Amino acid sequence: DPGDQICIGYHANNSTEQVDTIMEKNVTVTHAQDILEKKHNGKLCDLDGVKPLILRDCSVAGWLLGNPMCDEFINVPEWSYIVEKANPVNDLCYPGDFNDYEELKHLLSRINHFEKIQIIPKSSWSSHEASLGVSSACPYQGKSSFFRNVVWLIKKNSTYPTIKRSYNNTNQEDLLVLWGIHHPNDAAEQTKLYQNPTTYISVGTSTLNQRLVPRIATRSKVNGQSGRMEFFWTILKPNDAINFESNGNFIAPEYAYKIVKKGDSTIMKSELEYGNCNTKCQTPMGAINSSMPFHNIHPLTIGECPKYVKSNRLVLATGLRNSP
Amino acid sequence: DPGDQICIGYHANNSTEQVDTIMEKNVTVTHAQDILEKKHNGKLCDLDGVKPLILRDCSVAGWLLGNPMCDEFINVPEWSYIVEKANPVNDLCYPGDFNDYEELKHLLSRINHFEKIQIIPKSSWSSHEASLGVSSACPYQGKSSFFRNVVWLIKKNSTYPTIKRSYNNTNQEDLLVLWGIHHPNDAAEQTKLYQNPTTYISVGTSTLNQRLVPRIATRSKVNGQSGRMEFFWTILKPNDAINFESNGNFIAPEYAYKIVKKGDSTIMKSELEYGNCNTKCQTPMGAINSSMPFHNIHPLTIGECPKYVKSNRLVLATGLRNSP
Amino acid sequence: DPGDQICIGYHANNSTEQVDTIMEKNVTVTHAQDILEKKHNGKLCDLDGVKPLILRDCSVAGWLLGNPMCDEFINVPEWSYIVEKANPVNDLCYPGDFNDYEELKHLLSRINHFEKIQIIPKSSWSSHEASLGVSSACPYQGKSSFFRNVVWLIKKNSTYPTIKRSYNNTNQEDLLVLWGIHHPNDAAEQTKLYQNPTTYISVGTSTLNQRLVPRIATRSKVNGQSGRMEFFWTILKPNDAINFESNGNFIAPEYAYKIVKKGDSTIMKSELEYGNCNTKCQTPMGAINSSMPFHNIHPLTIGECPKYVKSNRLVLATGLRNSP
Amino acid sequence: XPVSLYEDPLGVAGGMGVY
Amino acid sequence: XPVSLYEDPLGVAGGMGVY
Amino acid sequence: XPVSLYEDPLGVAGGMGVY
Amino acid sequence: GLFGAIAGFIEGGWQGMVDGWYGYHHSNEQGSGYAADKESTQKAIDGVTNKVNSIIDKMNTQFEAVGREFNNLERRIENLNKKMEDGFLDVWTYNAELLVLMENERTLDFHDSNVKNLYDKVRLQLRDNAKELGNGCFEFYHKCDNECMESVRNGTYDYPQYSEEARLKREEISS
Amino acid sequence: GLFGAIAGFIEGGWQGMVDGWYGYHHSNEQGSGYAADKESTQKAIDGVTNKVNSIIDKMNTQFEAVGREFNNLERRIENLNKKMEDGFLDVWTYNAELLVLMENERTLDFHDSNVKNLYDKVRLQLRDNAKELGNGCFEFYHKCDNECMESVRNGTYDYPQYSEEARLKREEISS
Amino acid sequence: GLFGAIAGFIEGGWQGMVDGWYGYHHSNEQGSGYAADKESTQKAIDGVTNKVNSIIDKMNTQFEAVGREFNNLERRIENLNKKMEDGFLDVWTYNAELLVLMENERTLDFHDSNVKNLYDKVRLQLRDNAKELGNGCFEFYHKCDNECMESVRNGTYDYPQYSEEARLKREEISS
Ligand SMILES: *[C@@H]1O[C@H](CO)[C@@H](O)[C@H](O)[C@H]1NC(C)=O
Ligand SMILES: *[C@@H]1O[C@H](CO)[C@@H](O)[C@H](O)[C@H]1NC(C)=O
Ligand SMILES: *[C@@H]1O[C@H](CO)[C@@H](O)[C@H](O)[C@H]1NC(C)=O
Ligand SMILES: *[C@@H]1O[C@H](CO)[C@@H](O)[C@H](O)[C@H]1NC(C)=O
Ligand SMILES: *[C@@H]1O[C@H](CO)[C@@H](O)[C@H](O)[C@H]1NC(C)=O
Ligand SMILES: *[C@@H]1O[C@H](CO)[C@@H](O)[C@H](O)[C@H]1NC(C)=O
Ligand SMILES: *[C@@H]1O[C@H](CO)[C@@H](O)[C@H](O)[C@H]1NC(C)=O
Ligand SMILES: *[C@@H]1O[C@H](CO)[C@@H](O)[C@H](O)[C@H]1NC(C)=O
Ligand SMILES: *[C@@H]1O[C@H](CO)[C@@H](O)[C@H](O)[C@H]1NC(C)=O
């Protein structure tokens, strides 16, 4: 009659977790490991305690040039990343162009802190009117204004003497210098603002050899103006010196930027705003708080992040094929 | 004596199909699936009923500027893709340069239909000779000619008054405007054609601020000419306006292009010509008519195509190792 | 009592080779195959008998322009690859810029042999002083000098007549022509060197239509000089001709380069020097002498090389799991 | 012919059990 | 609870043999 | 030595059966 | 074969079993003939179909080349563009070819193991009521009508039914 | 199952064996109960843990996207940049998804073969001292106290100890 | 081991079998010694050689880096170029390392299954003419000269030749 028995078998449980294989989908297993992070907090937070630089409605150009509507960013502290909207409304209040703009923003994505210094004081213009260069395209508190960091110089007593100003970068750090040129509408306005009919702006450093010349043309009125302002920049190295010579149309430097902290940063394109939180990984859609090796939130992240993948599901089978 | 038997076995057949594995090549199987399309019809066909734009011996520049040898393309209908030969013979009949040409062709690869409109009528030049600008480098029916869509303006009665012409894009669509400048051989020809010795061409829109100046130089004769014609273009947005000012060397716009249909298109480099067929997938070597997931015809395709791979053979084993 | 026996078993040996698997690391096997080359000879050697071009302390610009400190490379023989240091000390002795420099070095990485020819002899300047253009920034044997392959032309008897010189490439090969322009410090030096106040340099070929104009500016002194020399180049095709017109600031061509051998080459960035050896595969850190399919030395190689990978170890298991 | 022993949408057993 | 039958740092057997 | 029991071009059995 | 069944202890295939990948050939004295096992063959067709669809689906996010044009002074970025496109093409060709190789190997082993599992199933069914001939066949220690043939083909074979007639002939053969 | 054990000749799993992936259920007349085999389950947990760490480690050199900006007349290189980044993202998504599919399949087969090896181990231990019921169970031809139960669970079962009592009952059943 | 032979029911390897990956060790009273199975070992060397050549061949279309140079105002495209090249290098390093891991695992399992198939082959040859000791050995129920040793090594063993002397000793052991 039936002898003793011993049977060999395997684990089953209440598990409903499903994994996929090449030959079979939706296979229930006793044990799985989800390895895909699908959740974020929907907020722009500090990165490891350092607060980002949220530019709100101002672009990078409006920030560094000093668009009057960007006074919130007159002297920003050290940041962890920069946030800029897709189409900021406060860009070039006076219409024009920003030469080599994208290369400058690339430079930006490796700087963590600027230190603004006055290299050419607006006071020191004795032979020119340094306080008339204002416009209604750049308004501030109901009265015409202009970019705070550059000086729109005007003739003084129907005279525009030949400016020859030099600045020698005596600091220890690289110095981001910005300047500009005016393109008026006609020779009338040209003489009205600068007296001299054919003008120029020579800029020189150890590697820069530039001579701008104003281009006059009738153009469409943007923000009221048909004239244009075209801005240029360079990185003046320590012990090097920049030289400006001009007889008109000069948008002189006043403040420049000392690059005092470098490191890994980014210009993140996001419509969100500061969310008063902290994270170790930030995306333009929200911060991530996860131990998982993967995520599917956004490809552009900063911090100690999971690796991004486009999948909606990524689950490893650890246990057995689970019996019903 | 021998009891009844039952044997367990497996399928064999007449199959000669071979698959490869890591450890063994050319393994015969009872059942395989070829997944690689290796055949095409050798013809350039319509894409889902829409006929392409075959430029034959004319380049993109000769088409849009109106090289007299390109009259077949004076008013092309909506297309599915564009076809251009590797080295078209009808390009710039009058030798010169096409500024930002490759960016313009990139723009092209997303447009399906132009609509040519006359924005500056060749009639309306009362103070200049608008019908003398012809050349033997651009011949048409045995008599000197020029690009049909731009006007080579000449002095009238030893006078070239300062043109100031503006066009305001009143349409709903973007407008591709083209214009140009003449570089003559010497100051002699300069005065002979335009009277004024130092000339210019200012162009202005809401974002464009251009001032061209003719460059005189002795050059090699290409297609008979040592002078050059340099062409420029822009996309004038709706409600925006373009302004031209010139005292010579102006190759004025006559016809511009209304971008009336956008979508996915391509400039395909092919030496074939129209083959009066239809397809759902086109390559520069022939159309593909296949259900297979892969093909090895050409990397550059358009339509609902298989995925391209460089392999000469791709066969999946579905059945068993087949017995001899 | 115990009948005869036969046992089925498998090989074991003295092997200590270890391989890794997904589920287990450091598994000892009886037989393995290392497939990763980790060793090099630390020398820059000939590539298949052809010696490279070691530029030592001279850059590509100093070589082709003829920086006096680069006389070792006045007429280099056919090479297999070029070697240039990260920051050569003999570059532009007279400070300035090299237009389209990186595109020219890209052209270089497909040329194996130049043949220098005199296209405009320094003798043939009868109306200009062709032997005064020297500088202390370009010294040679304790006396001021200049780039050997271009002529810095000076006024003769307070005169600078309008040069109009043409060279027609009569050879069978493409011809690399180089020339340049001077930017002085002030109008004083401008008249002192060239007499004429407003100068120009027109350059023309079948496709080139250039007109340079000197830019005057006060700049920082580099190697003693605040003036700059800006160099330009082009590839003159056979039967085509180049035309120069100038009234000052012209750095005229003397020697040009006949492209007589093309093929696969490279500009390798290396601090090593010639090691009097031969190899079939070269890296900027040393030559490789290997039959293995992989290596981890450097990504940038030339020759018949293994495939580069970033791993520190790559071992295939061929035999069994080895018993202790 | 017009019937098969198996559900074989892709034909991985091409012809086996079709009559 | 605070002890397990197995060394399971990643929890590939989640809960099996922990008491 | 100069002979082997096996066809082993790559030496995946390094030395096994060579005399 | 990884599992030693196909071209292993079963040396060849059956051209006569035409409506199945795996199956049986019986030979009692009612007669002899082939019969396909359709549950296992349909399970295998399911697996192979899902494998084909898996490969093809995983390959629909593969790189698509784009025509781009550059002028005489943009040779660096034209070369960059060409090497970008050729690199992605080489990557996806490697992916396709290697996936095909690996999954071909695994498919052949899958069929091998299916045969082996069928054989083991009926061997475990019959136990000592049959001698294991070593070539994929079982010699019955009793007599099996065409219906206990289907009973071993459908997994409902009663060992205690013929237990002691099989033990009859087992004791007989042992002397 | 590639090895025919899980959901094969062993048809289902044991909800009652709660502290092990594989193991035994004994039933002698001292009683019956479940006991997990912890050597095999811990070996399997080692393998699965190393597999998870292997996948995650191989994925830490994967491509990281970078924001880059271009102006209205740089549409060619902006398109090039976008397709470069999207191509690398598609490549690494393919890598992750496909590695997960393949290693899931191999993990399930790994558990299957672990069960099969356990069964074969105790079958080879017991030999003809037990009848093989064909469902994962062995019916002892002798009597097995709760301690020869642990003797077959720890691999130290003495066949010649009960050799001839098993041969007793084998000769008995044969008549 | 996936197949339970190597380091499974066969616990260790033979340092004494020096001219073969798999093989036999016989012990009749003419003597005892090792003999390699060269058909199986050569089949395995074929498989492993083709695998090595397969890996190396699939890797010859791998990405090759190219030196490219950029100036101070081309930092965007220089960064793009660097990330393109490093991305392709990371991709191909992943491919190589992962293919090596996977194929190493499959090679070890391949050797395991070769051993298992050899063992099963001679077990199916001998059937009840030998007792299965459970460690890779068979104890002959008759006497096997050094030539039926080669008869079991070359697959030509006649079961009905010693059928009833084996049945002699089987009936003897059963009492
Ligand atoms: C797997 O399950 C999901 C829902 O959980 C379903 O959407 C999907 O279609 C299923 N896959 C298959 C192959 O049935
Ligand atoms: C063009 O005309 C429209 C009238 O439809 C006007 O609104 C717009 O301001 C004009 N643009 C310019 C630049 O004059
Ligand atoms: C999220 O971060 C907070 C702060 O460090 C932490 O308390 C919390 O545990 C994290 N989330 C999870 C799920 O651990
Ligand atoms: C496989 O067969 C083809 C011809 O059908 C032959 O060219 C190739 O060399 C064969 N491969 C091997 C490894 O023999
Ligand atoms: C250059 O000289 C050749 C004579 O060999 C002539 O055919 C060609 O037209 C000349 N080119 C120019 C631009 O004068
Ligand atoms: C090719 O396309 C035509 C038109 O739709 C169709 O009739 C034909 O069946 C297609 N080719 C194949 C092989 O199906
Ligand atoms: C494998 O061995 C190396 C030293 O040979 C050691 O550094 C490494 O940590 C070992 N790996 C593991 C998983 O123990
Ligand atoms: C700038 O000033 C420093 C003094 O600290 C001097 O060494 C340097 O040469 C100056 N540079 C120029 C261009 O004058
Ligand atoms: C290295 O190259 C030399 C010269 O051809 C050759 O003699 C030597 O054998 C090579 N190294 C090895 C390890 O074979």
Numbering used by the authors:
A (entry chain A), B (entry chain A), C (entry chain A): 8 to 55, 55A, 56 to 83, 83A, 84 to 96, 96A, 97 to 125, 125A, ...
D (entry chain G), E (entry chain G), F (entry chain G): 1 to 19
G (entry chain B), H (entry chain B), I (entry chain B): 1 to 175
Provide excerpts from the study:
Here we report a unique, efficient and effective structure-based strategy to design peptidic modalities based on a single domain antibody. This strategy was used to graft the relatively long and flexible CDR3 loop of the single domain antibody sdAb38 onto dipeptide templates to design mimetics that can potently bind and neutralize influenza A viruses. To elucidate the structural basis of binding and neutralization of influenza virus by the PMD-based peptides, crystal structures of the neutralizing (template-based CP1 and CP8) and non-neutralizing (non-template based CP14) peptides in complex with H1/PR8 and H5/Viet HAs were determined at 1.59–2.87 Å resolution, respectively. All peptides recognize the hydrophobic surface and embedded cavities at the interface of HA1-HA2 in the HA stem region. This region is highly conserved in HAs across influenza A groups 1 and 2 and influenza B viruses, and the target of HA stem broadly neutralizing antibodies (bnAbs), including sdAb3854.
To evaluate the structural basis of the decrease in binding and neutralization activity of CP1 against H5 HA versus H1 HA, we compared the crystal structures of CP1 bound to H1/PR8 and H5/Viet HAs. The presence of HA1 Val40 in the binding site of H1/PR8 HA allows for better steric accessibility of the peptide macrocycle, whereas the corresponding Gln40 in H5 has a relatively long and flexible side chain. The peptide macrocycle then moves ~1 Å away from binding site surface in H5/Viet HA, potentially contributing towards a 14-fold faster koff rate and corresponding decrease in binding and neutralization activity of CP1 against H5. When tested against a broad panel of HAs in SPR, peptide CP1 shows heterosubtypic group 1 HA breadth and specificity, but no binding against group 2 or influenza B HAs.
